[PDB]
RNA sequence: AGCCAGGAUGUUGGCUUAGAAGCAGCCAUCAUUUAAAGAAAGCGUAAUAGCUCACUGGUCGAGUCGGCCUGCGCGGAAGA
């Protein structure tokens, strides 16, 4: 799982989680690993293809936010109940 | 065929469904049979679809059923007046939402599994679809 | 949209004559055919053709893709034309020419007494084959599709009018 | 074996040379006898092994006149005496008696060396290797 | 013939052809499956 | 895609039986040769042969297919 890029988000719940899901965006967070959660969204493009693929949660992941780029692995997925749609997803700092 | 034995009640509110409920995610094997609707479920269904299976794996693998009816429900033998208390209960009911996984495979081909739930969905009221591990 | 690009060829003995929407060619085959270039236009090459779509017509290739086999179907139509296939099983059974009128004896009441389109002729050179002549590939399968059509083929017997084709539709019996 | 085009199978036993089920439709019709053809190999049999009739494959010419495409011992019946296998062995790596030497293999090939087209005995391992993977023995050390 | 209310693409010489608004079911080997409609 | 040409060898695969040559029970889903070739889908049938195939190649020539997402349809579709 070759480097990936996200974009920090400040607008939130419902309706601007339903507005970054309009077939474009993700929202995803990542969080321990000694420092603070940290709330970004993410492009459509790769990640989903990359999570069909089990080697994406038994392999770390390298991210870049604000230029720069850091390491995590897969947590958890929370998908959509009547459509094959992803809802949000979880990283754990290394 | 599928009911409990005891009851603390069997008098009940029929209810509506919500349309959420626990599912998606296929985690007894590595292939499944997703809802992907509302509707009405029974335990014959449930044996129909049981007695479909068998025809096509016959013994091979493992098939988990993760469903089991929600309520007991009231019915009176012949066509009547209502009136005079509710009947009683010789079968059991659930209502059914597009998230629910029915049934789930692991020790089989991907395209016997996809034919078994196939043969096993014919059994059922609604359109139903194929589900996958999805890796997680 | 794919055939509308095809050279399709010429044999030297049609020369190919065209003027706006109406073409003109002739060869040995006793035919004098002028066919219309109207919702379409093609260009010639001495040897070879080219169609594209006209002005204030259908756009893209697909109606141009038509045209091309219907022109090529007459190059053929004027020069040798087109070779047989149908047949007639049954003794006793008999195809006969009389004139513009055609007869089929099929073991019934009558022998059909039909009479021919305009711009074809029948020929039977024994009496069990069946021949259409002429130019026009449409006249020559559609009125064998016409005569095949009485009485039809019979299913043990295999009595009737037939194609020369390797399927077989005649049924074998079963024990009892 | 060779030319085995269009030809059936039969056992020599004369416990299947009255019932007709077992046998190809259309041998008897051309004109074959299935005792005389159980006569003609006995002594055949006698000589290669002991209260098992052989599995031949038949031919039949004008005036009904019978030949053999089989005159040696069968792979599968070299390799019940040469494994600990009652009579096969199934799935591949599932009981201790399920493996052979590929010395022995080689071994028991070259008993049936009459029936090698290959002109080397590398070639007669490539032609008895088969029978082996069908009976699900081990070959690979 | 019978038209049941759906057709299988059950052998190899088997295609299934719609033709004028109609889907049929034609086998060049074995004309028992001549179906119409699907 | 069509048109054209092939579709082996161990092997008569192994077992079990009532029964046999994918194709009336069961086992492996083997290996070498090769550009390629299964103990399999539907026929053939009393069967075999063989086709319709899997699987490759030539020819031609630049896009092509199953599933899926998302907008919009058709036939399926009878009554006094």
Redesign the pocket.
């Known amino acids: 799982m070759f480097t990936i890029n996200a974009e920090v988000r400040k607008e939130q719940g419902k309706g601007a989680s339903r507005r970054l899901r309009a ?1 474009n965006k993700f929202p995803a967070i990542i969080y321990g690993g000694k420092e603070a959660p940290l709330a970004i969204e993410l492009d459509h493009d790769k990640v989903m293809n990359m999570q069909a693929k089990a080697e994406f949660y038994s392999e770390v992941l390298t991210i870049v936010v604000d230029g720069k780029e850091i390491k995590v692995k897969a947590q958890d997925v929370q998908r959509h109940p009547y ?3 992803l809802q949000h997803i979880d990283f754990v700092r290394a | 065929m599928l009911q409990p034995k005891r009851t603390k009640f069997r008098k009940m509110h029929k209810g509506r469904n919500r349309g959420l409920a626990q599912g998606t995610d296929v985690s007894f094997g590595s292939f499944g049979l997703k809802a992907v609707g509302r509707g009405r479920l029974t335990a014959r269904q449930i044996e129909a679809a049981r007695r479909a299976m068998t025809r096509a794996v016959k013994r091979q693998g493992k098939i988990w059923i993760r469903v089991f009816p929600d309520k007991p429900i009231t019915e009176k033998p012949l066509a009547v007046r209502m009136g005079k208390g509710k009947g009683n209960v010789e079968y059991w009911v659930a209502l059914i939402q597009p998230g629910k996984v029915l049934y789930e495979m692991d020790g089989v081909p991907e395209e016997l599994a996809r034919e078994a739930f196939k043969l096993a969905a014919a059994k059922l009221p609604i359109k139903t ?1 194929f589900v996958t591990k999805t890796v997680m | 949209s794919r055939v509308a690009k095809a050279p399709v060829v010429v044999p030297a003995g049609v020369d190919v004559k065209i003027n706006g929407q109406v073409i003109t060619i002739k060869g040995k085959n006793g035919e004098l055919t002028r066919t219309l270039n109207d919702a379409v236009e093609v260009k010639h090459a001495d040897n070879t053709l080219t169609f594209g779509p006209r002005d204030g017509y259908a756009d893209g290739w697909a109606q141009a893709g038509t045209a091309r086999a219907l022109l090529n179907s007459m190059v053929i139509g004027v020069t040798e034309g087109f070779t047989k296939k149908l047949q007639l099983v049954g003794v006793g059974y008999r195809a006969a020419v009389k004139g513009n009128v055609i007869n089929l004896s099929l073991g019934f009441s009558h022998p059909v007494d039909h009479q021919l389109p305009a711009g074809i002729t029948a020929e039977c050179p024994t009496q069990t084959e069946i021949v259409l002549k002429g130019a026009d590939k449409q006249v020559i399968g559609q009125v064998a599709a016409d005569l095949r059509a009485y009485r039809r083929p019979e299913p043990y017997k295999g009595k009737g009018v037939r194609y020369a084709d390797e399927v077989v539709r005649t049924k ?1 019996a079963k024990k009892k | ?1 060779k030319k ?6 039969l056992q020599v036993a004369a416990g299947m040379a009255n ?1 007709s ?2 046998v ?3 041998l008897g ?1 051309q004109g074959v006898n299935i005792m005389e053809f159980c006569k003609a190999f006995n002594a055949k049999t006698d000589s290669i092994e002991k209260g098992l009739p052989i ?3 038949i031919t039949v010419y004008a005036d009904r006149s019978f030949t053999f ?2 005159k040696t011992p ?3 019946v070299l390799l019940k005496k040469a494994a600990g296998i ?7 790596n599932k009981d201790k008696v399920g493996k052979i030497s590929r010395a022995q293999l080689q071994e028991i090939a070259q008993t049936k060396a009459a029936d090698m087209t290959g002109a080397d005995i590398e070639a007669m391992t ?6 082996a ?4 023995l081990v070959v690979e050390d | 013939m019978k038209v049941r ?1 759906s057709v299988k693409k ?4 088997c295609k299934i052809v719609k033709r004028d ?2 889907i049929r079911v034609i086998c060049s ?2 004309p028992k499956h001549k179906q119409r ?2």
């Open positions: 077939a459509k094959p749609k | 679809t | 074998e | 074996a085995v085009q269009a030809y059936v199978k019932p089920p077992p190809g439709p259309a019709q599995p031949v494959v495409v089989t069968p792979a599968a009652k009579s096969g062995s199934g799935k591949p490539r032609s008895i290797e088969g029978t993977r069908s009976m699900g | 209310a059950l052998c190899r010489n608004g109609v080997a074995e409609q699907g």
